[PDB]
Every structure is written in structure tokens, then in C-alpha cells.
Amino acid sequence: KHPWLSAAVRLADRDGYVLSGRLSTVEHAWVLDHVVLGTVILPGTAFVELALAAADAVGLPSVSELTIEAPLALPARGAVTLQVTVEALDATGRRGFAVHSRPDGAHDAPWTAHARGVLGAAPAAATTAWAAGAWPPAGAEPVDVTRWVEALDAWVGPAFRGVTAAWRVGRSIYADLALPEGVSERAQDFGLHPALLDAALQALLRAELGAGSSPREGIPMPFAWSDVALEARGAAALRARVEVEDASDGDQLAASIELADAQGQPVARAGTFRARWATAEHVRKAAAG
Structure with a gap:
């Protein structure tokens, strides 16, 4: 069902x-x-x-x-x-x-x-060995997930604060993702709860819009996904590896996403996610139709 x-x-x-x-x-x-x-x-x-x-x-x-x-x-x-x-x-x-x-x-x-x-x-299939053993992987630098990002923190409610910790090794972002209390109770009803997959995007954005980044208007908005497959349904909390692609287009962000369960085993993967920067007015107009 x-x-x-x-x-x-x-x-x-x-x-x-x-x-x-x-x-x-x-x-x-x-x-x-x-x-x-x-x-x-x-x-x-x-x-x-x-x-x-x-x-x-x-x-x-x-x-x-x-x-x-x-x-x-x-x-x-x-x-x-x-x-x-x-x-x-x-x-x-x-x-x-x-x-x-x-x-x-x-x-x-x-x-x-x-x-x-x-x-x-x-x-x-992609291995989840990165989720086993040392966590975060060796050489990782922390991403401060509490650091304010206006495009997220000014707006979203509690269900869309699903990143409990994150780090980076080069182009790879590693994160602990967890649905907040209340929201987590329905996780088992979904294939992959949308707020949990969205937390992988939150981790990417907090890394990319965070310390040392150049300020920009608006927010990257997903417009395309490729090769998304589930291995296990109903997860409420996960480890994630988000590998950022070198951006050949300045207005876009692209990455792969791999998700592992608490036992180190594969849950889901997205071969590609692509987003484009959008202004507030663009989003308002698009939603209005």
C-alpha cells in the first residue's frame, strides 16, 4: 500500500x-x-x-x-x-x-x-563500504549543519531539518540523516520518505551555501533525476554520500546520492540529481502556474 x-x-x-x-x-x-x-x-x-x-x-x-x-x-x-x-x-x-x-x-x-x-x-550497484568503520571517513572536514543558511533557515519547518551531522572529503559530502520526531513515525509507510531524501539535498546545500561560499540570490531547485533505485523501503534514518559533479554550468548543481542503513547496507541510490538556481519570484510564479 x-x-x-x-x-x-x-x-x-x-x-x-x-x-x-x-x-x-x-x-x-x-x-x-x-x-x-x-x-x-x-x-x-x-x-x-x-x-x-x-x-x-x-x-x-x-x-x-x-x-x-x-x-x-x-x-x-x-x-x-x-x-x-x-x-x-x-x-x-x-x-x-x-x-x-x-x-x-x-x-x-x-x-x-x-x-x-x-x-x-x-x-x-554501488558499495556502501564508506558507511562502515570509521565515520566520518578519514580526512573529513566538518560541515557545520547548524550554521545559518538564509535560503533554508529563514523558511523551512521542522520536517525539513533532517541533517544531524555532515562532513566533506573533497567532492564527497558524508552525512547522518534522520527524520525528526513525529515525522519519523510514518517513515515505514513510504518507499523513501520524501523528507528523508530531501535531507540529502539539505546536506549538499549546507555544504555548498556555507562557510567560504560566495553569496548568491535564491536557492538551487531540483529539476532532474537519473537512475534512482531503492534496495530497501521504509527507512527513517540513513547515512548518505553525496558526490558533487564538477559544475560545467555556473547556474547548476549536480551530484550523485548513495544511502546506507544503520547496519551499513544499501538503501537507495540516485545516479544523478540536477538543480538550477532559482529566485523567490521564479518559484512563486511557477507555483502559481
């Missing part, structure tokens, strides 16, 4: 699936803590979670690609209806998909597309 998807229909007239559900900000008030430069939107890691749920429903192991097209503005006390569409399996073993929402109750309001991509085979 899933907290946000209540039906998974295998289509009868073509090779495809339609997953439907509902996201209530009363039942899941934690999502409202995701305030982005003043605008309340669902975290993009929630689209990853929904795509991972679709992969499980259709028997594929990975989200090969996901593009975020438009944010999902969250009602202060209401619900949105969700739909995940999954297309036919092609000769390379891949399926297109899309994630959509519409305001709850308005049964002929138009659907809004938030994310699209392709489901497929899983990429190569």
Missing part, C-alpha cells in the same frame, strides 16, 4: 497503468514545512517517491529518468488528487510515466503535470 496512492489499475485495452490517490495536507501536515523562498510547494523528492511507487507497481526496479516540469502548490488545509500514468513497456525494457495532480473536489478541473520520465532497469 502507499499513503498517497490508493488504486493501481492495470489497463485492459493497452499495456499501461493508472495509479490514483490523494494527498491531504491535514493528514500529512509535514509537507507544509517545505517552504521554498516563501512559497509552499511539495518537495520534488515526493515526485521521486511517487515514481518509485509506480516502478514497484509495474515490476521495474528503477526510475531511469525524471524531469520536474512544474511545482505542486500545497493547500494550507486541503487535499489534492494525484495520478501517475505509466505507458507501455518498450523493446528496451523501459516505460514512460507522468505524475499529475488536481485540486481535490473539483472533478472536472484540469490535471496539472508535475513530472515525467522513464522507468527501467537498475544501474550498477
Whole structure:
């Protein structure tokens, strides 16, 4: 089952699936803590979670690609209806998909597309030996996760403060991630709780927007993910390795993410995450539609 998807229909007239559900900000008030430069939107890691749920429903192991097209503005006390569409399996073993929402109750309001991509085979496994033994890895320098970062600390609520400690060795950020109290109780209901995957992004941003960085307007916003596969569902706390790619584009940030459980074993990996710097007005306008 899933907290946000209540039906998974295998289509009868073509090779495809339609997953439907509902996201209530009363039942899941934690999502409202995701305030982005003043605008309340669902975290993009929630689209990853929904795509991972679709992969499980259709028997594929990975989200090969996901593009975020438009944010999902969250009602202060209401619900949105969700739909995940999954297309036919092609000769390379891949399926297109899309994630959509519409305001709850308005049964002929138009659907809004938030994310699209392709489901497929899983990429190569990555060791989690970095999570075993010495922690942090030898030679690490601390990242002060309590140091103020305006773009995060001015805005987000408690569910989106999920980094308990972080360090860096060169391009690799190592972090302890944990869902806050209250929020953690639902972790077992998700494939990968969106606030827990978002904590890996928080660790990256605190490292990149922190001490010694040049000030910049706004915040990097995820727009694309590649090769995201879960090995274990329902985790509440993790160790993370976030390896930053050398940025060939000054307006973008890119990294891989690897997550390990408390026993040192793999939980999930994202081959690539890509973000682009966005201003407050850009986010406001995008959420307004």
C-alpha cells in the first residue's frame, strides 16, 4: 500500500497503468514545512517517491529518468488528487510515466503535470563500504549543519531539518540523516520518505551555501533525476554520500546520492540529481502556474 496512492489499475485495452490517490495536507501536515523562498510547494523528492511507487507497481526496479516540469502548490488545509500514468513497456525494457495532480473536489478541473520520465532497469550497484568503520571517513572536514543558511533557515519547518551531522572529503559530502520526531513515525509507510531524501539535498546545500561560499540570490531547485533505485523501503534514518559533479554550468548543481542503513547496507541510490538556481519570484510564479 502507499499513503498517497490508493488504486493501481492495470489497463485492459493497452499495456499501461493508472495509479490514483490523494494527498491531504491535514493528514500529512509535514509537507507544509517545505517552504521554498516563501512559497509552499511539495518537495520534488515526493515526485521521486511517487515514481518509485509506480516502478514497484509495474515490476521495474528503477526510475531511469525524471524531469520536474512544474511545482505542486500545497493547500494550507486541503487535499489534492494525484495520478501517475505509466505507458507501455518498450523493446528496451523501459516505460514512460507522468505524475499529475488536481485540486481535490473539483472533478472536472484540469490535471496539472508535475513530472515525467522513464522507468527501467537498475544501474550498477554501488558499495556502501564508506558507511562502515570509521565515520566520518578519514580526512573529513566538518560541515557545520547548524550554521545559518538564509535560503533554508529563514523558511523551512521542522520536517525539513533532517541533517544531524555532515562532513566533506573533497567532492564527497558524508552525512547522518534522520527524520525528526513525529515525522519519523510514518517513515515505514513510504518507499523513501520524501523528507528523508530531501535531507540529502539539505546536506549538499549546507555544504555548498556555507562557510567560504560566495553569496548568491535564491536557492538551487531540483529539476532532474537519473537512475534512482531503492534496495530497501521504509527507512527513517540513513547515512548518505553525496558526490558533487564538477559544475560545467555556473547556474547548476549536480551530484550523485548513495544511502546506507544503520547496519551499513544499501538503501537507495540516485545516479544523478540536477538543480538550477532559482529566485523567490521564479518559484512563486511557477507555483502559481
